[PDB]
Amino acid sequence: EINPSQLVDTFEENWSFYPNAVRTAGFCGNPSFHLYWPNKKTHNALSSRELIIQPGYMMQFKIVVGCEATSCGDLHSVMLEYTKDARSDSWQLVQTQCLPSSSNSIGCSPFQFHEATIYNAVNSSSWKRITIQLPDHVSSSATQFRWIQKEKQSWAIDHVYIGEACPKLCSGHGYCTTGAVCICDESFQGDDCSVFSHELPSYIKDNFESARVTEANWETIQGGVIGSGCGQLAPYAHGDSLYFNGCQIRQAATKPLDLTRASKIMFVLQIGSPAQTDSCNSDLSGPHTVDKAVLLQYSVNNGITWHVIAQHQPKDFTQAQRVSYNVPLEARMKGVLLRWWQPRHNGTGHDQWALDHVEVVLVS
Ligand SMILES: *[C@@H]1O[C@H](CO)[C@@H](O[C@@H]2O[C@H](CO)[C@@H](O[C@@H]3O[C@H](CO[C@H]4O[C@H](CO)[C@@H](O)[C@H](O[C@H]5O[C@H](CO)[C@@H](O)[C@H](O)[C@@H]5O)[C@@H]4O)[C@@H](O)[C@H](O[C@H]4O[C@H](CO)[C@@H](O)[C@H](O)[C@@H]4O)[C@@H]3O)[C@H](O)[C@H]2NC(C)=O)[C@H](O)[C@H]1NC(C)=O
Ligand SMILES: *[C@@H]1O[C@H](CO)[C@@H](O[C@@H]2O[C@H](CO)[C@@H](O[C@@H]3O[C@H](CO[C@H]4O[C@H](CO)[C@@H](O)[C@H](O)[C@@H]4O)[C@@H](O)[C@H](O)[C@@H]3O)[C@H](O)[C@H]2NC(C)=O)[C@H](O)[C@H]1NC(C)=O
Ligand SMILES: [Ca+2]
Ligand SMILES: [Ca+2]
Secondary structure, X not given: OOOOOOEEEOOOOOOOOOOOOEEEEOOOOOOOEEEEEOOOOOOOEEEOOOEEEXXXXXXXEEEEOOOOOXXXXXXXXXXXXXXXXXXXXXXXXXXXXXXXXXXXXXXXXXXXXEOOOEEOHHHHOOOEEEEEEOOHHHOEEEEEEXXXXXXXXXXXXXXXXXXXXXXXXXXXOEEEEOOOEEEEOOOEEOXXXXXXXXXXXXXXXXXXXXXXXXXXXXXXEEOOEEEOOOOOOOOOOOOOEEEEOOOOOEEEEEOOEEOOOOXXXXXEEEEOOOOOEOOEOOOOOOOOOOOOOEEEEEEOOOOOOOEEEEEEOHHXXXXXXXXXXXXXXXXXXXXEEEEEEEOOOOOOOOOOEEEEEEEEOOOO
């Protein structure tokens, strides 16, 4: 007598309206059946049925926006929204931006900084799997979600799951299926898919003096290259730094590490320059200075949630400094990710930063 409480579709009555959508396969590296919107007179979108949803539900899907495109273009954002009565066209984003500058609103928790649920060619140029512990304001007796792109960019969706949160959201190494059970990815096991079958590195060392060691050490490096834009990083460091001048997302996130024996995280950081050069500058007058800080974060779920170890405001790092932090107990586990990230910035030529002497002591 009530609407369904789950929706699983790897690709009939699950989906309400899907303008311009086409059910195909083999787009941009996905061999499975998925639905695609081509680049080819309406807002193309994909909506769902009305769903009863309760606090503690999750949403997980696979998405592409612009296959193999250069990121610096704003292009056409795919927004993931929710609604509670379709008759009134009251649609709101599933997750809103939660930055250090923003107040703690409905979506935003104190220090759990995340992004919004809009997806662009910058982010999903490759098939990415997004997992969200959806906020409690989404829950209702008949909630509908939709992906809308309000001359267009292609985009695609596959393996959608909306329903009860299964243990630990499958730990970011597995997918949730019918009945709130977790089917793990390759080489991961357990009821929550947290246990890695193989072993992981004990500690990471990187002075960025050889491109091969850095290519082995890091999983994602976005918006920055091995260079010397802010100069030789410090009195504390030398040579080529990881220097972030690139447009859009500026990020350096390690491969999975084993931090059970990790003691402290040390590095040398600079944000801007005393010279305030075009290669390396910082806006200390703007009110959004907190968003232009370099956040050090850790993740135990392979990227679903990041927790702050330290924040580095640009006012305190005009001259590069060496810093050391204790690895929190919650982060002293197997399969931990470390990340250096700039939340906001003004594109190339603005708000640059450099990183060097990445050292995990991991020793008595
Ligand atoms: C980096 O990137 C950011 C974003 O693009 C730049 O920030 C922009 O700076 C310019 C100034 O160079 C701002 O223009 C001014 O806007 C005010 C009115 O602002 C009000 O209304 C805006 C929408 O209409 C709104 O965005 C504003 O809110 C911003 O600022 C408040 C705090 O002030 C903050 O709470 C918000 O979150 C936003 O950050 C605000 O509500 C206007 O009065 C100004 O006009 C004067 O100056 C111009 C010439 O400069 C002149 O022609 C006018 O007659 C008048 O004298 C001016 O237009 C712009 O709003 C900013 N945008 C954002 C999104 O913040 C930043 O400058 C870039 N560079 C650097 C180095 O940081
Ligand atoms: C990559 O993925 C990101 C998320 O994973 C995508 O992020 C979103 O990108 C769009 C731009 O394409 C941004 O949209 C703008 O955001 C501002 C902020 O809204 C403010 O409004 C109220 C005013 O009352 C204020 O209180 C809020 O705190 C906000 O500050 C909007 O006003 C604009 O209309 C516009 O929507 C998103 O902000 C941004 N999300 C995040 C988390 O930053 C992103 O698009 C993808 N691609 C790229 C290139 O980054
Ligand atoms: Ca599929
Ligand atoms: Ca170096």
